[PDB]
Design a protein around this ligand. Sequence first.
Ligand SMILES: C[C@H](CN[C@H](c1ccccc1)[C@@H]1CNc2cc(-c3cnn(C)c3)cnc2O1)c1ccc(C#N)cc1
Ligand SMILES: [Cl-]
Length: 329
Amino acid sequence: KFSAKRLPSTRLGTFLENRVNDFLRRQNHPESGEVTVRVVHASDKTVEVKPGMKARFVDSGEMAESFPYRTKALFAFEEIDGVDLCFFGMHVQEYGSDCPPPNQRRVYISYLDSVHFFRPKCLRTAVYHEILIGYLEYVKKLGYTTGHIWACPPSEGDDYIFHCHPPDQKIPKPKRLQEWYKKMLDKAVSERIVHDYKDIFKQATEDRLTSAKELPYFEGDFWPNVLEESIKELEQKTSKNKSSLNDLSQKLYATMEKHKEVFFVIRLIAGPAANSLPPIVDPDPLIPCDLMDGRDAFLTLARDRHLEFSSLRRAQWSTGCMLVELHTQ
Ligand SMILES: C[C@H](CN[C@H](c1ccccc1)[C@@H]1CNc2cc(-c3cnn(C)c3)cnc2O1)c1ccc(C#N)cc1
Ligand SMILES: [Cl-]
């Protein structure tokens, strides 16, 4: 027995678990258990502007070469019949106040994962929502002004965090997923945490973006790849001399409009408040941990040790083995 509670605490983990546990005590369903939330990885990294954008905007001195962020991995656990189950995982990128524009004071959710056995089932969505809303409230309080979600569904073919999901864990279709995020965000608005939210196209237009260098540039996100493909397309075109008598931006706006419902921009701090904030100071220390850096290490260790999250039983066993790995290391 190495319970989840034994892992080192953080201000972030504590704030999230308090919000969940408080919510659950309000509901007072007899099936629910205590929820533990632990940050198991935090390190400092940079996202590099890829070759095409570098040539056009970095090399000309118009855009930073890379953007510093803090990556965090965290997990939520539920005690079920006296035994911790890992049911939720999240990886985020946090761009602080010392980050050059356009990434300044922005959080991006890299990946969400879950193992759908939260007990009771009827509170499962609500709990997921409380974690996400809590995360937004927490980073708002530190002074992050904007959250960013890429709201596409996972593939059976490529596990985000947990190796081997339940065969009957249901992957949403795009429109259902988008509605899930809106319901979460609507609750956040009603709690006066999120001021408002927009699709990326409406957000860009209102900020009067005119150059791609002004678009937030996140590690592994859709938009850096779009820009690389667009730039390649543009530089492939030749044309002959004319007779006597912003393409990039136009392509960007076109692609943004086409895909707008997938990409959410979440305004946490609005209007004058946003202009005169103090520095962002994160009270939590770095947490080196090779196992929980990126995704491949933990997926590798689960593959190699035949751990699965495909049933409650197996998921509890994998939880236990994971926790024992996190202690020993
Ligand atoms: C808060 C949760 C997050 N759930 C994740 C998630 C991330 C991003 C988008 C959706 C889901 C996971 C990601 N991976 C995944 C795999 C499978 C799977 C793989 N093989 N098989 C047979 C099933 C089923 N559900 C998953 O949801 C959550 C749960 C439900 C919704 C909805 N709607 C949203 C978030
Ligand atoms: Cl010709």
